[PDB]
Amino acid sequence: MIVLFVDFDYFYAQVEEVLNPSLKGKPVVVCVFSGRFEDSGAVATANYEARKFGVKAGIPIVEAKKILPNAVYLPMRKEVYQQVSSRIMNLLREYSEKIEIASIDEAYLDISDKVRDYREAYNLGLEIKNKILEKEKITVTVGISKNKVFAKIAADMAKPNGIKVIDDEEVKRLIRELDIADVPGIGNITAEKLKKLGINKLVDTLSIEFDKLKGMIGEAKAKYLISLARDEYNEPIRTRVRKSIGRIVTMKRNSRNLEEIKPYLFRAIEESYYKLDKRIPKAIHVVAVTEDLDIVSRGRTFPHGISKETAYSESVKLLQKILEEDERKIRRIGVRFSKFIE
């Protein structure tokens, strides 16, 4: 197999530079303004300038405006970003019908049948970079390998405005030498569990008892990591079928008052039914994020489809149940639907 992964460079900030040539040269910081007080929220994307002056994704807007107050700070236009994103995906379709969109700024292409080797893979990568820059004035980073995981790591190594091949020999090396924390799907918490079991590199998963690994990180991760380590991972490039669909929103003020919370819950439900489109769910869970950012949820599965009306009615009973059983103020509220009708 030959896989080509495309990752748009510092996407949201870059798109603002397109829509406003002026931002040329300026550090640019796109934020999620949560609306709870002035500058409440976090940084979504920071361009290269902002980064070298110590600004990065996921830090508070205020903590960022300390570290460098000089930068230009903008708000999300998810919809505008989505239009650009969607168009770029359509351009990628031109190069391969076997596409997997992983997020608003990332996609895999299976080009096993569109090229013969990595020399030609690299060349097509350049065509893609040219074509996207030409149509959308957005640079991307392209990673190329024998599977999805190593294609993604290639791009991580080559960011920004890059292109990289990890060949069969570099795969073997990385299996032994790549910090396992840098493998997609492995976060700080898993890395720390892995490290205490003596597992710092992919290859290490081959010298521990499976049951111990599975017992510590669950079966899916253990198998995932082992199949990579044996150089046998080969999941097809295919857009994944969602098992749940939902929405969760931050409230402007923390609360336990149903009549304050409902508007948010009901909007979240309505937008969830727009996303559901034609799928009818049989399960609903109401999810509350408390004022200390703990996550509580209550749910119910029905023996039949749930209409939006039923969702409204049932959501309220589930929110009441949460309010009965946890005394904290609620900060975010939302819902998750699942168990769709075949």
Added chain:
DNA sequence: GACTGGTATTGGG
């Protein structure tokens, strides 16, 4: 902040 997927824990016909 806003999502979803996986799974240890749990309770009801």
Added chain:
DNA sequence: CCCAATACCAGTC
């Protein structure tokens, strides 16, 4: 009860 249903834990972007 013990397995489908929970209500968490976790990673990503």
